[PDB]
Write a protein that binds this ligand. Sequence first.
Ligand code: BB2
Ligand code: NI
Length: 179
Amino acid sequence: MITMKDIIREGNPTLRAVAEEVPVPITEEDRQLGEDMLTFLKNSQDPVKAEELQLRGGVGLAAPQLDISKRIIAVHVPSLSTVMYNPKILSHSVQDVCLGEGEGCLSVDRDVPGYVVRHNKITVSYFDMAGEKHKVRLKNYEAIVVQHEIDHINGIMFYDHINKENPFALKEGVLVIEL
Ligand SMILES: CCCCC[C@H](CC(=O)NO)C(=O)N[C@H](C(=O)N1CCC[C@H]1CO)C(C)C
Ligand code: NI
């Protein structure tokens, strides 16, 4: 089962590499990995299990974070709960958005203050565990989570987006989500 022991941290080069496309039809191993990833997210959100297993809560996870350089992401937003294989953003809004409390990441063991501005709306295509294609329109928090995970498969970390000089600057027009 995935626990914090399996999640690599900032400094590990795999987090900055570009993940490899996975085969379609989906391999049984990639299917299994996806299942284990979703199970981790659910476990991390269960107050009791999170304590038992000493897990940090998370709403998304990308294969590279497990030192598996593959384009596989799992999301469990408290809704949206699924595993996306070879996900790609086909289009996005002009309008941007950011979480008022900033972002964190299971691979980052330090607090990095500041706004992470992303697109408020995105259209994403992906293959599910059965290798069947889906095209979904996401927005707000769900869009933020998916962009955070897709960034991982492109070797990008949330803090790469922070304006170090002015971390809480808010360009006129950007939306804010407060959880
Ligand atoms: C919103 C963008 C998606 C964040 C995904 C991460 C999980 C992760 O490491 N993904 O790669 C998470 O849950 N992080 C948490 C997080 O940043 N959260 C949880 C509630 C919303 C937001 C607050 O900043 C903290 C607990 C580390
Ligand atoms: Ni992360």
